[PDB]
Amino acid sequence: PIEDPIVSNKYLISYIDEDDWSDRILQNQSVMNSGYIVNMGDDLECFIQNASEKTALLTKTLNQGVKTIFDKLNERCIFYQAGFWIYEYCPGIEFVQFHGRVNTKTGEIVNRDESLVYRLGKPKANVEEREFELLYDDVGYYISEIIGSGDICDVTGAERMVEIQYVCGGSNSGPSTIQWVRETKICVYEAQVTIPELCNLELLAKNEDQKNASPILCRMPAKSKIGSNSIDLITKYEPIFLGSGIYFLRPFNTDERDKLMVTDNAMSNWDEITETYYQKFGNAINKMLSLRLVSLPNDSCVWLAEVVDMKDRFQTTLSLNILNSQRAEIFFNKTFTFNEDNGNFLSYKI
């Protein structure tokens, strides 16, 4: 890993209320002595605060992960239609990119293009013999597999190979699938796969980003009297891209209620509601419930949440009742008024 004293330190700006700040940072002297306060003239004053076992897990992770990768891959090949290209990866045979499509029902290609001769690399049956590395990225720790034994590319004069990275797909039960694959160098390609079984290894566990940050406490000067800018939106709320142009703003305030957010232009006019709105919100909601973002209290309930634009302007309210199946219905009410006393769920049928 690479760091430097200008980037190694990491901060996270958090917002707190007005009378909260009045008697939370200002009244204690110990905290005031640990850090100091900065003023922007207006009330945007922020108080900044200044501040063998391991290797056994590294070494075991590498071994166990490779053996586990082969465990699932041993069943069959995998394939990913990357726009115009398709990359088929087999369990220790050879990696290539060819034109075509696959029939989801049988998992077989339409044809084999004898005319599209591409060679990404030849792995080896004797996986035990091959050497692998344990590197890391934003997603987490991963196993590196260089598949060589390729011909030289006259362009520069480098033998054809490919760099494969094994990462965990989180909650993705099944065999195995690829995320993306593309050329990286003149004759080198890169590919990344996601498998659920790698998460078994602590270092390769999903949702593990080293978020350790000296917190910087700020307070709202105006309390959103003007249209809150996007920077206020992402400092008050932690967005999560739910796809289809819909974000899920979860508040840092544990008391407040979370609200969806829309950004697409074709979903501007809410006075008329077309099928595109319903399909887009259905995809987004399916992805959300798959992400386990919405939190059941402690039971089936109706879920009511706002929708805001890039400027946190309320447009409608999304009403959703979960049916514990593939089907789901979504309603949009512009006329719905909110009770600040309760959160999202209002009707409980345990």
From Swiss-Prot:
Reported impact of residue 99 to A: Decrease of ER lumenal misfolded protein degradation
Residues the entry annotates as binding a mannooligosaccharide derivative: 85, 97, 154, 160, 183, 189
GO terms under cellular component: endoplasmic reticulum; endoplasmic reticulum lumen; endoplasmic reticulum membrane; Hrd1p ubiquitin ligase complex; Hrd1p ubiquitin ligase ERAD-L complex; luminal surveillance complex
Alphabetical UniProt keywords: Disulfide bond, Endoplasmic reticulum, Glycoprotein, Lectin, Membrane, Signal
Family from the record: Belongs to the OS-9 family.
Main location: endoplasmic reticulum
Function noted in UniProt: Lectin involved in the quality control of the secretory pathway. As a member of the endoplasmic reticulum-associated degradation lumenal (ERAD-L) surveillance system, targets misfolded endoplasmic reticulum lumenal glycoproteins for degradation. The recognition of targets is N-glycan specific. Functions in recruiting misfolded protein substrates in conjunction with HRD3.
SS bond list: 46-218, 77-90, 153-187, 168-199
Mutagenesis or variant effect for residue 183 to N: Decrease of ER lumenal misfolded protein degradation
Effect of inactivating the gene: Interaction of substrate with HRD1 is reduced; in YOS9 and USA1 double mutants this interaction is completely abolished. Interaction of substrate (either glycosylated or non-glycosylated) with HRD3 is not affected.
Keyword field contains Disulfide bond: yes
Name by which UniProt lists this protein: Protein OS-9 homolog
Domain notes: The MRH (mannose 6-phosphate receptor homology) domain is required for the ERAD-L activity.
Keyword Endoplasmic reticulum among UniProt keywords: yes
Entry's Gene Ontology BP terms: detection of unfolded protein; endoplasmic reticulum unfolded protein response; ERAD pathway; retrograde protein transport, ER to cytosol; ubiquitin-dependent glycoprotein ERAD pathway
Residue span(s) of domain MRH: 75-201
Topological relation to the membrane, as annotated: Peripheral membrane protein
Glycosylation positions in this chain: 28, 50, 333
GO terms, molecular function: identical protein binding; oligosaccharide binding
Source organism: Saccharomyces cerevisiae (strain ATCC 204508 / S288c)
Cellular compartments annotated: Endoplasmic reticulum membrane
Subunit annotation: Homodimer. Component of the HRD1 ubiquitin ligase complex which contains the E3 ligase HRD1, its cofactors HRD3, USA1 and DER1, substrate recruiting factor YOS9 and CDC48-binding protein UBX2. Within the complex, interacts (via N-terminus) with HRD3. In ERAD-L, HRD3 and YOS9 jointly bind misfolded glycoproteins in the endoplasmic reticulum (ER) lumen.
